[PDB]
């Protein structure tokens, strides 16, 4: 398998699924092997990835060769722990010798060509390399975006890789967005909108209700119709109160129901639900605005900003998602991923 | 030594693509029968329970129901389910290509060719043929009458491979009708299809309006001129006051009966604010209890109970309301306008049906045929002539059919080949080989002389006459700028990129590892 | 010198669907004409049924060959269609497939087989058109001459002379017969009870309940005034949770007091009205009536009729004019329904039985009450019955008639034959064979009676071929005489609907090449 | 850029033969040289033996990959072209299949790596000749040398002061050391008793039989004149069906007469040829003794031997020089061997011999006769001795004699390996890995003596490459010294007969690419 012209690896798991991969650390994943040096030399797959994520199969081969060598030479009477000594010695002298044959490569953003040089080496091997340029062009970038450089950390929370099914490879790109597998409820209201103050909120559009058990008692019908007038009072501030700061769009963590929906709607006032916690973080980060719980203290300065929001309908379908794109400074980017194959 | 499972096992030789070959094959000849106008439906049977019955004829749905066993036959499932997803037709040239490549992938590598020096060349065919078949695509839309008659066309085209064909003169332009309602709108929801049997195929129609399968409250009015519509998505059930935690606790049954009167009040006040938008019909998402609607039949309106979120969307889409909610204020987004709502009788059932909507941007096909598997196959035949027909609206670019592009693009791929050197240029004739092997199987399933025909093709081809292909009717080489073959430009370039891609996914696996079962 | 066509599956796939469909038609050949008799069907559970109806027939026998459940389901279309001819259709299916058959064995394509079948069909339309004559409503003559024609192969033709004609007024008095273009059979409510015999069957223009009188006081009511309820006589509770709490000892006597005058207020607001038969829909999660309600109904002297399902409240105030209620607030005389006379009968200790007769008001819906010894015959009765009423529903549907008793179909096969005589080419041979497998009715009609199939077949064709149309095999008289005069006629719409609906799903049957198992 | 060989089914196949290979050639590797110990093979049946044979290592240990099959069977065809080194041979072999899996592995021909080792043997068969020695028959000191050497890796070890000088007798009693060029060794019959120990193994230049005297009255005889007899002394008998009649009273008496007379008178014609003692041949079909013949023959002062072999009568004319009787006028004293003494010994109560010693013509043939406790012992003495034998035998065959102890195939490693550094190509690697493919010899040689392998290796190769030949592995010293001064040689041909079938062995088997598996 290594090598640009090595050859893929298909494997089907207990259940009947097909991944047809290259990665050593993967392909090592799914073969399950009941004797106990194939599980660590699995494990040394694994773990070579997780601390790198390149050379996984270079690392097992190395140790299988390794391996052969010393039962050559213990063919001849010598001791394993003299050839341990020995492997552990030549490893100093090799790992001395590639310290002092190595060379640097600048990191900045204003010139990206070494960075997609060793980014499109990675590529190669892979099926991938069908383009080999373009995707090893986003896959820098979406890098040094994300990257805080000051602390040499990169946090790849803040990158979310999604593929669907349909079009092309050629159609991987990089948002400097978030995506999401939602969609503006209501289907009245526009599917897309311009430069948007958004309102990132996490309470849901329903009447209030505390968490510890309570019990209101109702007495007269007078105290029902006062029930009624609290109910709808309550829609009509919360409404309100979301359009008083200005916002062009609302997004809400928990949904809410046809009470709140047609509000938003009759105020021109879009708005999704249901969006999940970590896409609700990846919203904040990228549009710049703040998480609120509530919406008594949402406040003109707690919206964040979006170049425009859109829906997508991905082909004959009808799996819309949502699109936000062109912030003004997005800490956190999309990689989206597009083929004729699940597998691929 | 043995080290994996019990049940678990390894190929890692000419063995495991020997399978993978095999099973790709398999599915391109289970495909096989099903292309062309001439081509032949098959019956699916289920074993298990049920025992499900279609009768079908494209391959995506073919290959979904039957349950594959080796891993390639379920990249070519995944391959025809995802290009039907994508475009919706060509799944079964998709299939039947990819096979036909990965076959001249096995005779290749039986002449000893690493699989790497096939996929370059490969690759370099596939660039060259989607630049040709680029090069050669034909556009409208500026026009209105052309384009009119090219969607006709693809319309006939994608329709005439199936049962429909039968009727094929009466069909496609009642698709491209439907499609005309759309506006624009890549909304293939707001199409719907209702089949009932009874009756000849011939009897399918578009309507000129709507048609809803829901029932009339009791006192409410069966029939209405000059339709006010107002379109809800409210409870009109109990009606919690959606407090949790709210309960009458109360020391006398007086009590009781008056905060029941007061619900009941509020109901009734729910339904004057209903009532004050100034409506004669309402059509409500959910239930409608027996209060609102003794309401609505006192007040003389008309009230719709269960129409579901793809009723009442499509109902907003062909009489322009709005889904509303909360009545507090009337003078905001307004109703829907039609000028009939009778009730109409399709063979024992009543649907009601809005005549003279304000929009077309909705409308319902009837299908009636003699058999409940009829039904079935006109109605996903149907579907896939429906979705060609809004991507080619989308997307204008046409390009001939019947072999006509890809022998164009075959004949691009072995002249690319002539100028290549090495063991490249045996992989892309191989390649111009399966591609041009589509036009064969058309012949073939046909009954013609595939042989001459492609023979035929091919000199027409090189020659120069770049609109030459199969007149099947009566058998010949014929031209498609004359006769009027037409496709989909999207169709042919995604049947293309995914066959060839689901190509060389296959073919660089030389170990396959199957787990033990659970 | 051709297409050497490797593949044999194909052809052995065509057979065994051809003789599949054979064998379902063979199966219930000798059920067909009046001298058919009915098939037993028993069910995996101990449920028996004698069964005469081709839908009925095919449906309980649970076959298992695809070309089978496609005659099924051709059966099942046909009836809804029409609702007579359901075994003819299948029998004419099956047959020209046998036909069908030799003409694959002859070296034919099966496309060209579909295209001369559809030919042969388009001729044969128009052949029944021509053929038929006009008829006309408010002819009772004729339409009793249907029914009966459609009730001579039941088991209750002894009792069509007191079965046809309350069959056809029915439908005379649910629609009217001036500006109608369809009937509906869902307010023809078929009521079916144990006991007595076949000749006991009645008519009724009035409301039949199988429910009971809950106060057994009062068992007639003359002149009533029926007023359906749709809340619940019993202690008030709301629909949020409801409570009440008791501190004192007083309080216990409050409780009992205040629901007691809750329950004696509705009653009166009740019995004010005018109200002397009240109806309680069946409620769920509310007890409809309390023993103390009922006992205040019982003391203001009034009949109580409690538990009538939600899906009947349409048809009741269809039936009696009256409207349903919610809210005791909006109970009035004015919307109250009345009627002549309410009887509760007990049937002979067979059963009891309520009768609403003599509505005041207009009602568009009669219901029959049909009686048998056992319940066999009483189920074969209901399904004759219905039978008749789809034969009316024909007639009323387009307005064509055309005689019976194998004469359409032999005239035909006459026309059609001759038509393909002047069809030169391999379309012929499949025109004759179409024409010549619609002589399987009246060979069926003549074997099933205990006449010679040959020379009746014969005969009849020497009489169609003189010009001597309208006429057929007479069991009567025991040979071929002319029908009309013997008043046997049949829709038109049942020959056509059966002929196309037979030809299309033959052409569907014949586009199948290959059957896998998923 | 060439061809892809898309099939790996004959790479898998090669690899799992020199796999299986390997393991039978290290299986075994513990049981070489003189500190290797022999292994206990306890077959299906109630069946057990102690053997440090090669062969018969492998014989019994019933294998079942075919390469195993092959090894087995080169094993046993060196037996029969050597008779010793029939372990090195089978080590050789896997050790270097060992070798070219490494150079499978590095992307060359199998035809490639087959031809390099046929012309890596045909240098070192050279090799091999030079660093040889001519050797001289009639020379007790090589022959007792090679026969000790050869009889050190045994159990028979302690003995080899007893059973050296005789298994050079042995072979020296049987051919003129003038002009043999072979030896015949179906001549020197191993007879087996339980009982005593093996220090009482003897050598006898006369007859050994293990039949027991018809009568117990003379057991020794002393001037013996042995005849032997393949005529049957019983009531007369024709070869068709035979039928006596009696119809009087007289028939009987004179019936049983005339069969009286005429065995008296067999016996008097045999007695008076001056026979002294007799021997029976073995038939079936007739008794060759009956009552009354034994009878009169013990009347008479005989010694009478019965159920004689068939198969031995040319062993016992032979040896004692008596030839086969078939016909009474044909039995006289021209044609009846003669012996100094004919004796029934008894072993000390475990049985009983007869033994003819002083035979007055001394036929090229001799006997030996072992002595154990149990019987594994036995029949491992029997191995050892038939091994020193087939020594001697190929040292008679060809006279040529090389140093032991893992010289010669060390310094045919050295020789090969600059041999290799003078090929530079493809058949490089391949030469080179032939040269240090036996090095397995030395190294084992080394590790079952406990000495370090790596550090013997090392000093034996240094000490061959300045030029100090004949140096090997001593155990006795525990070092490493020069080895004809320790008395420890072989014969060339084993060496090289051991070297030439190894390399077509594994010519052979490195032609395999596929096994099918017939019904
Ligand atoms: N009437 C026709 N004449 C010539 N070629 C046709 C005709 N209809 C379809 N084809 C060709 O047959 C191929 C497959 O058609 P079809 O079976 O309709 O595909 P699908 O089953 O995916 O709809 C198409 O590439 C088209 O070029
Ligand atoms: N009295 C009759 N005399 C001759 N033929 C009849 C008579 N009644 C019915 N038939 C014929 O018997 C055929 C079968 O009719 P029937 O069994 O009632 O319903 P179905 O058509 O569903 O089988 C009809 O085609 C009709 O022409
Ligand atoms: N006394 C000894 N000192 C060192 N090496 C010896 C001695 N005796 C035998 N050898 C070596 O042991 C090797 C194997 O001999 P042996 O085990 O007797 O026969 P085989 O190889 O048939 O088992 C010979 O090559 C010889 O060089
Ligand atoms: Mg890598
Ligand atoms: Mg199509
Ligand atoms: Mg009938
Ligand atoms: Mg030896």
Same mark, same amino acid.
């Given at each position: 398998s290594?090598g640009?012209?090595?050859?893929d690896?298909?494997?089907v798991?207990?259940?009947?699924?097909?991944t047809?991969?290259?990665?050593?650390?993967?392909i090592?994943?799914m073969?399950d092997?009941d004797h106990?040096?194939?599980?660590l030399?699995?494990e040394?797959?694994?773990?070579?990835?997780?601390?790198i994520?390149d050379?996984?199969?270079?690392?097992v081969?190395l140790?299988?060769?390794?391996?052969e060598?010393?039962?050559?030479?213990?063919?001849?009477?010598i001791?394993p722990?003299?050839?341990?000594?020995?492997?552990?010695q030549?490893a100093?002298?090799?790992?001395?010798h590639l310290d002092?044959?190595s060379?640097?490569?600048?990191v900045?953003?204003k010139?990206?060509e070494?960075?997609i040089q060793t980014?499109?080496?990675?590529?190669?091997?892979?099926?991938?390399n069908?383009?080999?340029?373009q995707?090893?062009?986003i896959?820098?970038?979406?890098?040094?975006?994300?990257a805080?450089?000051?602390?040499?950390d990169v946090?790849?929370?803040?990158?979310?890789?999604?593929?669907?099914?349909?079009?092309?490879?050629?159609?991987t790109?990089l948002?400097?967005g978030v995506?999401?597998?939602?969609d503006?409820?209501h289907?009245?209201?526009?599917?897309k909108v311009?430069?948007?103050?958004i309102?990132?909120?996490?309470?849901?559009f329903?009447?209030p209700?505390?968490?510890?058990?309570?019990?209101?008692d109702?007495?007269?019908?007078?105290d029902?119709?006062?029930?009624q007038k609290?109910?709808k009072?309550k829609?009509?501030?919360?409404?309100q109160?979301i359009k008083?700061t200005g916002?062009?769009?609302?997004?809400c963590q928990?949904?809410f129901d046809d009470?709140?929906?047609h509000?938003?709607?009759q105020?021109n006032?879009?708005?999704?639900?249901?969006?999940?916690?970590?896409?609700?973080?990846?919203?904040?980060?990228?549009?710049g605005?703040?998480?609120?719980p509530?919406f008594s203290?949402l406040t003109?300065?707690?919206l964040?900003?979006?170049?425009l929001?859109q829906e997508?309908?991905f082909?004959?379908?009808?799996?819309?998602?949502?699109v936000?794109?062109?912030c003004?400074?997005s800490?956190?980017?999309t990689?989206?991923?597009?083929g004729?194959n699940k597998?691929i | 030594?043995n080290?994996?499972?019990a049940?678990?096992?390894?190929?890692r030789?000419?063995?495991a693509?020997?399978?993978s070959?095999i099973g790709?094959?398999?599915?391109?000849?289970?495909?096989?029968?099903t292309?062309?106008?001439?081509?032949?439906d098959?019956?699916?049977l289920?074993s298990g329970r049920?025992?499900?019955?279609?009768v079908?004829?494209d391959?995506?749905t073919?290959l979904?129901?039957?349950?594959?066993?080796?891993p390639?036959?379920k990249?070519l499932?995944?391959?025809?389910?995802? $290009?039907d997803?994508?475009?919706?037709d060509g799944?079964?040239s998709?299939?039947?290509?990819?096979?036909?490549?990965?076959?001249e992938?096995?005779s290749?590598?039986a002449?000893?060719?690493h699989?790497?020096?096939?996929?370059?060349?490969?690759r370099?065919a596939?660039?060259?043929?989607?630049?040709?078949?680029?090069?050669?695509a034909v556009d409208?839309?500026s026009?209105?009458?052309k384009?009119?008659?090219?969607?006709?066309?693809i319309?006939?085209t994608?329709?005439?491979?199936?049962?429909?064909?039968?009727?094929?003169?009466?069909?496609?332009?009642?698709?491209?009708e439907a499609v005309?309602?759309?506006?624009?709108?890549?909304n293939l929801?707001?199409?719907?299809?209702?089949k009932?049997?009874?009756?000849?195929?011939?009897?399918?129609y578009?309507?000129e309006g709507?048609?809803?399968?829901?029932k009339?409250?009791?006192?409410?009015?069966?029939r209405?001129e000059?339709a006010k519509?107002?379109?809800?998505?409210?409870?009109?059930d109990t009606?919690?006051?959606?407090?949790?935690?709210?309960?009458v606790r109360?020391?006398?049954?007086?009590?009781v009966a008056?905060?029941?009167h007061?619900?009941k009040?509020? /109901?009734k006040?729910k339904?004057?604010r209903?009532?004050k938008?100034?409506?004669?019909?309402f059509?409500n998402?959910?239930?409608?209890?027996?209060?609102?609607e003794?309401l609505?039949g006192?007040?003389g309106?008309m009230?719709?109970?269960?129409?579901d979120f793809?009723?009442?969307?499509?109902?907003?889409?062909v009489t322009?309301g709005?889904?509303?909610?909360?009545?507090d204020?009337?003078?905001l987004?307004?109703?829907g306008?039609?000028?009939?709502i009778?009730e109409?009788?399709?063979?024992?059932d009543?649907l009601?049906?809005?005549?003279?909507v304000?929009?077309?941007?909705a409308?319902?096909?009837?299908?009636?045929?003699?058999?409940?598997?009829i039904?079935?196959?006109a109605?996903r035949?149907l579907?896939?002539?429906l979705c060609?027909?809004?991507?080619?609206?989308?997307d204008?670019?046409?390009?001939?059919?019947?072999?006509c592009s890809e022998?164009?693009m075959?004949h691009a791929?072995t002249?690319?080949?002539n100028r290549?050197?090495?063991k490249?240029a045996?992989?892309?004739?191989?390649?111009?080989?399966?591609?041009? /092997?589509?036009?064969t199987?058309?012949a073939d399933?046909?009954?013609y002389?595939?042989?001459?025909l492609?023979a035929?093709?091919?000199?027409?081809?090189?020659?120069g006459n770049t609109?030459?292909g199969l007149?099947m009717?009566?058998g010949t080489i014929g031209?498609?700028?004359?006769?009027?073959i037409?496709?989909s430009? $999207?169709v042919?370039?995604?049947?293309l990129?995914?066959?060839?891609?689901?190509?060389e996914?296959?073919?660089?696996?030389?170990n396959?590892?199957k787990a033990?079962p659970r | 010198?051709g297409?050497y066509?490797?593949?044999?599956?194909?052809?052995?796939?065509?057979?065994?669907?051809?003789?599949?469909?054979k064998?379902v038609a063979?199966?219930?050949?000798?059920?067909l004409?009046?001298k058919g008799?009915?098939?037993?069907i028993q069910?995996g559970?101990?449920?028996?049924?004698?069964?005469?109806?081709?839908?009925?027939?095919?449906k309980?026998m649970?076959?298992?060959?695809?070309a089978a459940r496609?005659?099924?389901?051709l059966?099942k279309?046909?009836?809804?269609?029409?609702?007579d001819?359901?075994?003819?259709?299948?029998?004419?299916a099956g047959?020209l497939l046998d036909?069908?058959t030799?003409l694959?064995?002859?070296?034919?394509?099966?496309?060209?087989i579909?295209?001369?079948?559809?030919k042969?069909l388009?001729k *044969?339309?128009?052949?029944?058109?021509?053929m038929?004559r006009?008829?006309?409503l408010?002819?009772?003559?004729?339409?009793?001459?249907?029914?009966?024609?459609?009730?001579?192969?039941?088991?209750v033709?002894?009792?069509?002379?007191?079965?046809?004609?309350?069959?056809?007024?029915?439908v005379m008095k649910?629609?009217?017969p001036?500006?109608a273009?369809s009937?509906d059979?869902?307010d023809? &409510?078929?009521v079916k009870?144990?006991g007595?015999?076949?000749?006991?069957?009645?008519l009724?223009?009035?409301?039949?309940?199988?429910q009971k009188?809950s106060?057994?006081?009062?068992?007639?009511?003359? &002149?009533?005034?029926?007023?359906?309820?749709?809340?619940?006589?019993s202690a008030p509770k709301?629909?949020?949770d409801?409570?009440?709490?008791?501190?004192?000892?007083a309080?216990?006597?409050?409780?009992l007091?205040?629901?007691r005058?809750?329950?004696?207020?509705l009653?009166?607001?009740?019995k004010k009205t005018?109200?002397?038969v009240l109806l309680?829909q069946?409620?769920?999660?509310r007890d409809a009536?309390?023993?103390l309600?009922?006992?205040?109904?019982?003391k203001?002297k009034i009949?109580?009729?409690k538990?009538?399902?939600?899906?009947?409240?349409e048809?009741?105030?269809?039936?009696?004019?009256?409207k349903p209620?919610?809210?005791?607030?909006?109970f009035?005389?004015?919307?109250?329904?009345?009627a002549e006379?309410?009887?509760?009968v007990?049937?002979?200790?067979?059963?009891?039985?309520?009768?609403?007769?003599?509505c005041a008001?207009?009602?568009?819906?009669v219901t029959?009450?049909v009686?048998?010894?056992?319940?066999?015959?009483i189920?074969?009765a209901?399904?004759?019955?219905?039978?008749?009423?789809?034969?009316?529903?024909?007639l009323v549907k387009?307005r064509?008639?055309?005689? *019976?008793?194998?004469?359409?179909?032999?005239?035909?096969?006459?026309?059609?034959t001759?038509?393909?005589?002047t069809?030169? *080419?391999?379309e012929?041979?499949?025109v004759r064979?179409?024409?010549?497998?619609m002589?399987?009715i009246?060979?069926?009609?003549?074997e099933?009676?205990?006449?010679?199939?040959?020379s009746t077949?014969?005969?009849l064709?020497?009489?169609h071929?003189?010009?001597? &149309?309208?006429?057929?095999?007479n069991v009567?008289? *025991?040979?071929?005489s002319?029908?009309?005069?013997?008043?046997?006629?049949?829709?038109?719409?049942?020959?056509?609907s059966a002929?196309?609906?037979?030809?299309?799903?033959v052409?569907?049957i014949?586009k199948?090449?290959?059957?896998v198992?998923?």
């Amino acid at each position: 398998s290594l090598g640009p012209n090595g050859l893929d690896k298909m494997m089907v798991d207990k259940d009947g699924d097909v991944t047809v991969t290259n990665d050593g650390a993967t392909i090592l994943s799914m073969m399950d092997v009941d004797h106990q040096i194939a599980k660590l030399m699995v494990e040394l797959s694994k773990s070579q990835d997780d601390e790198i994520g390149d050379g996984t199969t270079g690392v097992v081969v190395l140790a299988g060769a390794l391996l052969e060598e010393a039962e050559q030479l213990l063919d001849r009477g010598i001791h394993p722990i003299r050839i341990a000594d020995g492997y552990e010695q030549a490893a100093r002298v090799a790992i001395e010798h590639l310290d002092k044959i190595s060379d640097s490569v600048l990191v900045d953003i204003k010139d990206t060509e070494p960075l997609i040089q060793t980014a499109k080496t990675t590529l190669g091997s892979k099926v991938v390399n069908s383009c080999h340029r373009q995707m090893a062009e986003i896959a820098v970038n979406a890098v040094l975006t994300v990257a805080d450089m000051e602390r040499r950390d990169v946090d790849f929370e803040l990158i979310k890789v999604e593929g669907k099914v349909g079009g092309r490879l050629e159609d991987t790109k990089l948002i400097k967005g978030v995506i999401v597998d939602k969609d503006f409820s209501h289907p009245q209201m526009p599917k897309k909108v311009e430069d948007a103050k958004i309102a990132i909120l996490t309470c849901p559009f329903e009447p209030p209700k505390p968490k510890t058990k309570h019990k209101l008692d109702v007495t007269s019908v007078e105290d029902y119709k006062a029930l009624q007038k609290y109910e709808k009072e309550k829609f009509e501030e919360m409404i309100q109160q979301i359009k008083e700061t200005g916002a062009n769009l609302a997004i809400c963590q928990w949904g809410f129901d046809d009470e709140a929906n047609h509000l938003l709607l009759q105020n021109n006032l879009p708005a999704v639900r249901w969006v999940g916690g970590p896409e609700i973080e990846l919203i904040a980060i990228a549009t710049g605005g703040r998480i609120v719980p509530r919406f008594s203290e949402l406040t003109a300065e707690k919206l964040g900003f979006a170049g425009l929001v859109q829906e997508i309908s991905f082909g004959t379908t009808k799996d819309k998602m949502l699109v936000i794109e062109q912030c003004k400074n997005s800490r956190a980017v999309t990689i989206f991923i597009r083929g004729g194959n699940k597998m691929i | 030594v043995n080290i994996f499972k019990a049940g678990a096992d390894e190929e890692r030789a000419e063995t495991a693509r020997l399978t993978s070959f095999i099973g790709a094959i398999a599915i391109g000849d289970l495909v096989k029968s099903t292309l062309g106008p001439k081509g032949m439906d098959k019956i699916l049977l289920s074993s298990g329970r049920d025992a499900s019955l279609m009768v079908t004829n494209d391959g995506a749905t073919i290959l979904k129901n039957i349950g594959v066993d080796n891993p390639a036959a379920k990249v070519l499932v995944d391959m025809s389910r995802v $290009q039907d997803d994508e475009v919706g037709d060509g799944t079964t040239s998709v299939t039947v290509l990819a096979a036909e490549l990965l076959r001249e992938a096995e005779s290749l590598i039986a002449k000893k060719i690493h699989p790497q020096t096939i996929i370059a060349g490969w690759r370099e065919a596939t660039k060259a043929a989607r630049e040709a078949l680029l090069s050669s695509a034909v556009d409208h839309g500026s026009d209105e009458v052309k384009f009119r008659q090219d969607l006709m066309n693809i319309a006939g085209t994608t329709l005439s491979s199936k049962l429909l064909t039968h009727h094929k003169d009466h069909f496609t332009k009642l698709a491209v009708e439907a499609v005309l309602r759309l506006k624009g709108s890549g909304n293939l929801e707001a199409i719907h299809i209702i089949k009932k049997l009874g009756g000849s195929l011939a009897d399918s129609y578009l309507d000129e309006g709507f048609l809803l399968d829901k029932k009339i409250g009791v006192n409410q009015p069966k029939r209405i001129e000059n339709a006010k519509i107002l379109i809800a998505n409210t409870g009109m059930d109990t009606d919690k006051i959606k407090i949790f935690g709210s309960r009458v606790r109360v020391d006398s049954t007086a009590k009781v009966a008056e905060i029941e009167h007061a619900e009941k009040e509020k /109901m009734k006040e729910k339904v004057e604010r209903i009532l004050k938008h100034g409506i004669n019909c309402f059509i409500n998402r959910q239930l409608i209890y027996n209060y609102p609607e003794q309401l609505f039949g006192a007040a003389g309106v008309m009230a719709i109970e269960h129409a579901d979120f793809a009723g009442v969307e499509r109902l907003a889409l062909v009489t322009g309301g709005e889904i509303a909610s909360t009545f507090d204020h009337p003078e905001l987004v307004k109703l829907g306008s039609c000028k009939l709502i009778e009730e109409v009788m399709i063979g024992e059932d009543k649907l009601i049906h809005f005549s003279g909507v304000a929009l077309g941007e909705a409308c319902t096909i009837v299908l009636r045929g003699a058999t409940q598997q009829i039904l079935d196959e006109a109605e996903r035949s149907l579907h896939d002539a429906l979705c060609v027909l809004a991507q080619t609206v989308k997307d204008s670019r046409t390009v001939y059919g019947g072999g006509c592009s890809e022998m164009l693009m075959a004949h691009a791929v072995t002249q690319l080949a002539n100028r290549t050197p090495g063991k490249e240029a045996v992989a892309m004739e191989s390649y111009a080989k399966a591609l041009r /092997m589509l036009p064969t199987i058309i012949a073939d399933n046909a009954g013609y002389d595939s042989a001459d025909l492609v023979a035929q093709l091919r000199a027409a081809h090189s020659e120069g006459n770049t609109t030459a292909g199969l007149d099947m009717r009566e058998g010949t080489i014929g031209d498609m700028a004359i006769l009027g073959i037409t496709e989909s430009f $999207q169709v042919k370039r995604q049947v293309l990129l995914s066959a060839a891609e689901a190509a060389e996914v296959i073919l660089r696996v030389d170990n396959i590892i199957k787990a033990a079962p659970r | 010198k051709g297409a050497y066509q490797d593949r044999d599956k194909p052809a052995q796939i065509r057979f065994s669907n051809i003789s599949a469909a054979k064998a379902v038609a063979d199966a219930i050949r000798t059920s067909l004409g009046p001298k058919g008799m009915d098939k037993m069907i028993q069910d995996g559970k101990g449920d028996v049924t004698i069964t005469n109806d081709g839908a009925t027939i095919l449906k309980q026998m649970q076959v298992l060959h695809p070309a089978a459940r496609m005659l099924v389901e051709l059966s099942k279309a046909q009836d809804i269609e029409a609702g007579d001819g359901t075994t003819s259709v299948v029998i004419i299916a099956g047959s020209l497939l046998d036909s069908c058959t030799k003409l694959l064995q002859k070296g034919i394509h099966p496309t060209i087989i579909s295209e001369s079948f559809q030919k042969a069909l388009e001729k *044969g339309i128009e052949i029944l058109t021509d053929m038929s004559r006009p008829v006309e409503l408010s002819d009772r003559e004729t339409l009793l001459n249907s029914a009966t024609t459609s009730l001579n192969s039941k088991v209750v033709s002894q009792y069509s002379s007191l079965l046809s004609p309350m069959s056809v007024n029915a439908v005379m008095k649910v629609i009217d017969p001036a500006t109608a273009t369809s009937v509906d059979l869902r307010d023809i &409510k078929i009521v079916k009870k144990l006991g007595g015999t076949i000749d006991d069957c009645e008519l009724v223009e009035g409301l039949v309940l199988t429910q009971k009188v809950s106060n057994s006081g009062i068992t007639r009511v003359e &002149k009533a005034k029926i007023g359906l309820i749709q809340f619940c006589l019993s202690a008030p509770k709301t629909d949020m949770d409801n409570q009440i709490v008791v501190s004192d000892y007083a309080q216990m006597d409050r409780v009992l007091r205040e629901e007691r005058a809750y329950i004696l207020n509705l009653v009166k607001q009740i019995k004010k009205t005018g109200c002397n038969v009240l109806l309680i829909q069946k409620s769920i999660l509310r007890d409809a009536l309390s023993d103390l309600a009922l006992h205040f109904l019982n003391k203001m002297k009034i009949m109580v009729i409690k538990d009538i399902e939600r899906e009947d409240i349409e048809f009741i105030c269809k039936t009696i004019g009256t409207k349903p209620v919610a809210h005791i607030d909006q109970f009035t005389a004015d919307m109250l329904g009345s009627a002549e006379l309410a009887e509760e009968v007990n049937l002979n200790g067979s059963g009891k039985l309520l009768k609403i007769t003599g509505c005041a008001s207009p009602g568009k819906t009669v219901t029959i009450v049909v009686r048998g010894s056992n319940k066999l015959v009483i189920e074969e009765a209901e399904r004759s019955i219905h039978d008749a009423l789809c034969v009316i529903r024909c007639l009323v549907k387009k307005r064509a008639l055309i005689a *019976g008793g194998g004469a359409p179909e032999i005239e035909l096969a006459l026309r059609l034959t001759e038509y393909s005589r002047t069809l030169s *080419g391999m379309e012929s041979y499949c025109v004759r064979a179409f024409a010549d497998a619609m002589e399987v009715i009246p060979s069926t009609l003549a074997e099933n009676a205990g006449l010679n199939p040959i020379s009746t077949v014969t005969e009849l064709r020497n009489r169609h071929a003189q010009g001597e &149309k309208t006429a057929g095999i007479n069991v009567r008289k *025991g040979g071929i005489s002319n029908i009309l005069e013997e008043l046997v006629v049949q829709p038109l719409l049942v020959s056509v609907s059966a002929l196309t609906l037979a030809t299309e799903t033959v052409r569907s049957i014949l586009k199948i090449d290959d059957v896998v198992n998923t």
